[PDB]
């Protein structure tokens, strides 16, 4: 049940992969195609310290009360997108890529599949 | 001539104790170990139990 959720995550167009961070800081769980547990650990403490500032900051710096933020997103260069949406005690980043960025991504893996093609051509020709 | 003695007095050093740490490693609870991957495992079996 649970497994089906990351599944489901990586089925979406345009989402590299999703990690889940506690409130203690340990990540739940990590996308297989990113780093798994070092780039976790290294993504749940810039995280934490962003949405624990950002939560604080709402409160005080804008003097708003009772205002908390939902979801922030980050738009850097080339497809890099990363939405961040805290539920209960755990707050996941989900990294995504634009059409252009899955469109290369998707060439890449063409070109993969392709060397490996050669490579077996080349096996079977030594074994010939 | 008054007899003379001659007695040494130094101030105490503070003591001064070298320790070497690394805090690579990521946050973790004390009881677990992040080096050993059976107590990391374990923990996040429990906290996915919601």
């Known amino acids: 049940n649970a497994d089906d959720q990351l599944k489901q995550l990586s089925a979406l167009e345009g989402a590299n992969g999703y990690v889940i961070f506690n409130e203690s800081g340990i990540p739940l769980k990590r996308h297989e195609k990113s780093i798994s547990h070092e780039k976790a650990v290294h993504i749940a403490a810039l995280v934490s310290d962003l949405w624990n500032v950002s939560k604080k900051v709402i409160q005080r710096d804008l003097k708003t009360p009772e205002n908390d933020i939902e979801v922030i997103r980050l738009r850097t260069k080339h497809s890099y997108e990363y939405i961040i949406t805290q539920s209960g005690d755990f707050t996941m980043l989900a990294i995504q890529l634009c059409g252009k960025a899955i469109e290369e991504a998707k060439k890449a893996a063409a070109a993969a599949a392709a060397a490996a093609v050669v490579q077996e051509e080349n096996k079977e020709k030594e074994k010939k | ?50």
């Open chain 2, 1 to 50: 001539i008054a007899e003379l003695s001659e007695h040494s007095v130094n101030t105490e050093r503070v003591k001064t104790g070298d320790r070497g740490m690394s805090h690579k490693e990521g946050g973790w609870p004390g009881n677990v170990d992040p080096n050993e991957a059976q107590e990391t495992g374990r923990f996040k079996k429990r906290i996915e139990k919601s």
